Every structure is written in structure tokens, then in C-alpha cells.
From a paper:
The protein coded by locus c5321 from CFT073 E. coli was identified as one of nine potential vaccine candidates against ExPEC and was able to confer protection with an efficacy of 33% in a mouse model of sepsis. c5321 (known also as EsiB) lacks functional annotation and structurally belongs to the Sel1-like repeat (SLR) family. Structural domains composed of several such motifs are thought to act as interaction scaffolds to mediate protein-protein interactions. SLR-containing proteins are found in both prokaryotic (more prevalent) and eukaryotic organisms, and are thought to have been acquired by horizontal gene transfer. We have solved the structure of c5321 from uropathogenic Escherichia coli to 1.74 Å resolution. This antigen displays a super-helical Sel1-like repeat fold with eleven SLR units and a remarkably preserved consensus repeat sequence.
Here, we report the 1.74 Å-resolution crystal structure of c5321 from CFT073 E. coli determined by Se-Met SAD phasing. The crystallographic structure of the functional unit (aa 24–490) of c5321 has been solved by SAD phasing and refined to a resolution of 1.74 Å. The structure is composed of 11 SLR units, which to our knowledge represents the bacterial protein with the highest number of Sel1-like repeats solved up to date. The right-handed super-helix is approximately 115 Å in length, with a diameter of ~50 Å and a pitch (length of one complete helical turn measured parallel to the helix axes) of 60–65 Å. Electron density corresponding to a magnesium ion is identified in the c5321 structure, with the metal-ion-binding site located between repeats SLR3 and SLR4. Mg2+ coordination by residues of the intra-repeat loop, helix-1 and helix-1′ likely represents a means of stability/flexibility regulation in this region, for a currently unknown purpose. As the likely origin of the magnesium ion in the c5321 structure is MgCl2 used in the crystallization conditions, the natural metal ion for this system and its binding specificities remain to be determined. While disulfide bridges in HcpC lock the characteristic inter-repeat geometry, in c5321 a conserved tryptophan residue at repeat position 28 appears to contribute fundamentally in maintaining the same geometry by strengthening the inter-repeat hydrophobic core. Finally, the C-terminal region of the molecule contacts the C-terminal tail of the molecule in the adjacent asymmetric unit. Furthermore, crystal contacts observed between molecules belonging to neighbour asymmetric units share similarity to contacts characteristic for TPR-protein interactions with their physiological targets, suggesting a potential physiological interaction mode of c5321 with yet unidentified targets.
Residue numbers in the entry: 1 to 467
Write the structure that this text describes.
Amino acid sequence: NVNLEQLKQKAESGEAKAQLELGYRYFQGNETTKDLTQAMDWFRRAAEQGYTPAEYVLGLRYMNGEGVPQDYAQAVIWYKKAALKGLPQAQQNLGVMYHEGNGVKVDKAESVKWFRLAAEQGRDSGQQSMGDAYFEGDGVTRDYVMAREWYSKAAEQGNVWSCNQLGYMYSRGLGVERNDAISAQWYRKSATSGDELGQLHLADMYYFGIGVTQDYTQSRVLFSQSAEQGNSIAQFRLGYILEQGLAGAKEPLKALEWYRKSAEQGNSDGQYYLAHLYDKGAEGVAKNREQAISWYTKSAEQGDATAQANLGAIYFRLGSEEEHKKAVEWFRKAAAKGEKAAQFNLGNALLQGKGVKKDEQQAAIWMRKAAEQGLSAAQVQLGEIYYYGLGVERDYVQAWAWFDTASTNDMNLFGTENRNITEKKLTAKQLQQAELLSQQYIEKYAPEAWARMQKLKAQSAVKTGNK
Ligand SMILES: [Cl-]
Ligand SMILES: [Cl-]
Ligand SMILES: [Mg+2]
């Protein structure tokens, strides 16, 4: 428009708009050397005339301590001048000051008054603030319906936080009936904007086919975008996609790197998967006991029951007497959380008196818990517990039933052989009873096998009436 000298002439003539603009020339330092003293002087001259935008600007300068000592209380006074005259940005900032108790005592109801005025003028930050207020019940009574309405207005204008909130609410059924498809649409808007959490959530939805068609390639790309921004969950989820070759060839070395990124942030899942790669190895990844133990221990300490079970198992396979005791303590923690492998491992520890005093009655209890969760190895051991009467009264019918369950479950060879051996011990009626019992156990405690069997079983025909 006009240069500095021409602008100066207008400002000195008393034009408030020119005074504010001149202030900004000094503030920004583009056409003239940055000079906060001169910037403030001209900002103040414009505000002297009650020029609303300049009053708002002094609010910013006092709020931020730019060219003046930071002073929230004074910022509030300036914002209120401009807010009372309807300037949306001043209303929003004043609302924030009240919400935070910056320069004024916290007043959540008052914050909502100001957010509402800014929101009614269509500012997306105000609309978001109203959404958050109704979502939190902060200065207003909680109302997820109202929250959704305000978030929608903000999200339509590109407000990313509001997109994520809508994604969340539609996923959880807050103020609206759960709809995974609509949830995914909102998270997609977020993800396309470059948002780490929108990418994370949409990736997870493509992984499991929630609200969208299952698609590991889309999942990989979205997890990658979120992981590159540092998200520890996205990092291990991407790692798993890569290790398992779900969207490409298996890439175990690349998986390792992503698991390590996750693990180093303290993510117990990342720590688990990193440890698991060192535990089991993969193509190009050597087994490493020390690393497996170290990373399982961090994961286990964070309550990961899979890590607890696997750490104990490493110690049981190869460990000192103290390591066996530690293993039992880990199995105990994981068994308490319901991890079937830990219940099984604890059961066997108690049968042997390995790392713990031998206790066959307690062994049978843990073994049954594991067997009921479908672990065929536990079904075999529980069968032998009944066969030999270890912490239970000997019962060949129960033995046969658990062995047949294990055999049918996942073609456990020891189940099959033990069943065949036990059968000779049974009368014809005991065998009938054991077969019925195994049918019950298979349906309840090997349900995947039950379903497979039911779909394949020979069925009888029915004769239709004729003539
Ligand atoms: Cl703006
Ligand atoms: Cl695993
Ligand atoms: Mg709040």
C-alpha cells in the first residue's frame, strides 16, 4: 500500500488504523529495524482512541510479555475492552484467561460466556472451546450432544482436535449411537491434516476392519505416518506389521528398529516385541539372551503378563536356582492376571517343586485354570494329574476326557497317545461317560476346535413324507 514515511504521516495525523500498522512495522522489523519501544508507543497511540484491534494487541503484548513486562492482570483489562465491543479474538483470549485463572481467579462459567460469544461469531477456536466445555462439563453441565454439535462446527472449519474428538465420540457412543464408520470418517479428516493421533486411530481401524474395510497396506502407511512423528504405539504396531509381513515381505530387521524406538520411550508393548525378537530370533536377527531378558524385564515391571510369562520361561529353560524362584514370582503375577501360559508354567513348577515348594493340590488348581482357557499342554497335564492322582483323587474318566480334549484341540500328540493308553483302563460305560465329558470340555474349553468339528461332522438325513 504505502511506505513507512507515508504511514508515519498518516499515524501522526491521528489515523488509528495507520498507528496500529506502523506499530507492527516496528514490531516485525521488516521495512525498519525491529524496535519494541516504538512498536509499543504506536500500539498505545491507536488504543488511546479506543481503536478495538489495538486494545486487543496490547492484551497480547501484556499476555506474552513482548515489549512490556508480562502481566496477565493487565492483559485481561485490555482484552475486556475489546471483547465488550465484540472482537472475537479478544473474547476467546479473555475466555482462556478465566479458564486458566491467568490474571483473574479461575471462573469456568465466566470462561464459557466468552467462548460462547467468540463461537457464535464463527471462530473455530471458540467452537472447539465450547465443545470441550460441554464434553468436560466445565462451566456448563456435561452434554455430549451439545459437545458434538460444537465440535462439528469447528471440525468443518478444519479444527483437528475437534475431528479427533468426534472420532472418539462416535467410536465410544458418547452423545450419539456408536458408529465406527462415522468415527473413521472423522479420524480420516484428522489424519489427512497430518495429525499423529488421527493417523494412529485410523491405522488401527484399517488393521482390524473397524468402520472401514480391513487393509494392512493402509494400516502400514498410517502407522508409519504416526510413528515418524514419534508415537510409541504406532511404532510397535508398525513394527509388528513389518515383522509379520502383513503388507509386504517380512522385514524383521526394520521391525527391530521400530520396536526399539517404541521401547526406548517406555512403551511396554514395544519392550515386549523387542524382547520377543531377541528371544525367538528371526531371519537376520540373532537370538540374544541378555537383550531378551533386559527388555522382557522392563515390560514385565510394567505389568505385561506376556512378558512376565516369557521372562520366567527363559529362566526355567536356563537359569540358576534363584532365577527359578524369580521365574515363579513372575508366573504368579501373570497367572493372577489370567495369562494361561503363566498358569500352566506355575502349575508345572508346583508339581515339580521347581523354584517353589512342591504343592500338587495348588498345581492342579492352576493347571485347570490354564486348561479352561484352551491351552492343550495344560489339558494334557491336568489329564495326567487325574491319571496319577496328583493333588486330586485318581480318575481315569476325567483323565481320558482331558486327553481327548487336548488331542482334538490342536492335535497335541501327547493328548492322543495318553487318551489311547487310558482307554484300555475304562469299561464300556466309563468310556461312554468319558466321551460325553470330553464333548462338554471341548465345547467349553476348546471352542475353536468345537466349531471346526461341528462344521465337518457327518449329519443324518430326514425322510420326507410322500404319496
Ligand atoms: Cl486467525
Ligand atoms: Cl507374541
Ligand atoms: Mg475445561
